[PDB]
């Protein structure tokens, strides 16, 4: 019993974190086998961060311009290339701590753990979600670029996020591990703004199911709704549309609790209109949307 924002154990990722320095710029790198992955903005100069020409900047670099430090050990860079917004530094040593891993590009609404690091060393681990507007609501300071987000379902570390920048609203933007940004963002300090964010409806419903599984039913009601009527209401509260895919995805939690998906939708409609009137759900006084249907099953009985 209980329900917490639960991250994956971070040790498999901790053993991959390194510090990358180029000139006076330092950030974190991800050392897997004999490649160190890091944001290509490590090659920018403090002067030209509005319109860097990364191809031009990279061709002026030698392998020995990259200082890569794993703990107190300096790794020798023997090659380098750029893939989209990520730099790949080939090193002469394969990381003996490399876990089984893969790279995955996630969809908005998906969650993952973040190992926030500075100077190649971990500071903490927390759960995050890819927002509908392709930002993440992280906790990151200067020097955190190159920190990664990941899941570890079963034995395999799936890397899905590498941190690059902070937007003016204080939320974050970054790439997959192939260097493609999530969202319309670019690795430039030019003015960029996150679009309006919305609530991840299928996650809210998953979390209400977690509440019922943990023995709370006060917010259920006798009503059901249609999918289209629910979406008309949900939009008015800046909730994401619920698709038939989402309905299908909730099938398991629906079976475990005996509450049909569209019955739970009618309960969410009423919660949006009434609020919680001083009660809480799973210890929260607002509707939580960073637990996926899969997360709930992972955590609950």
């Amino acid at each position: 019993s209980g329900f917490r924002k639960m991250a994956f154990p971070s040790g498999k990722v901790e053993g991959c974190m390194v510090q990358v320095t180029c000139g006076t710029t330092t950030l974190n790198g991800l050392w897997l086998d004999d490649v160190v992955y890091c944001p290509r903005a490590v090659i920018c100069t403090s002067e030209d961060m509005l319109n860097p020409n990364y191809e031009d900047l990279l061709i002026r670099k030698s392998n020995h311009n990259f200082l890569v430090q794993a703990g107190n050990v300096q790794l020798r860079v023997i090659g380098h290339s750029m893939q989209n917004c990520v730099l790949k530094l080939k090193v002469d040593t394969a990381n003996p701590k490399t876990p089984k891993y893969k790279f995955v590009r996630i969809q908005p609404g998906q969650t993952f753990s973040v190992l926030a690091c500075y100077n190649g060393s971990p500071s903490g681990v927390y759960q995050c979600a890819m927002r509908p507007n392709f930002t993440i609501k992280g906790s990151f300071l200067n020097g955190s670029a190159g920190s990664v987000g990941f899941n570890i379902d079963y034995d395999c570390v799936s890397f899905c996020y590498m941190h690059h920048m902070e937007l003016p609203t204080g939320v974050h933007a970054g790439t997959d591990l192939e260097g493609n940004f999530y969202g319309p963002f670019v690795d430039r300090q030019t003015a960029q703004a996150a679009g309006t964010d919305t609530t991840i409806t299928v996650n809210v419903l998953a979390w209400l199911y977690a509440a019922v599984i943990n023995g709370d039913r006060w917010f259920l009601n006798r009503f059901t709704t249609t999918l289209n009527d629910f979406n008309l209401v949900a939009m008015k509260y800046n909730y994401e549309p619920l698709t038939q895919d989402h309905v299908d995805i909730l099938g398991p939690l629906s079976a475990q609790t005996g509450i049909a998906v569209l019955d739970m939708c009618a309960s969410l409609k009423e919660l949006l209109q009434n609020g919680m009137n001083g009660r809480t759900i799973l210890g929260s006084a607002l509707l939580e949307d960073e637990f996926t249907p899969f997360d709930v099953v992972r955590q609950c009985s």
């Binding site: 710029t25 944001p39 490590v42 403090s46 020097g143 920048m165 003016p168």
Partner: peptide, 8 residues
């Protein structure tokens, strides 16, 4: 107000 989060 967009900031790379490297450190310098």
């Amino acid at each position: 107000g967009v900031t790379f989060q490297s450190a310098v």
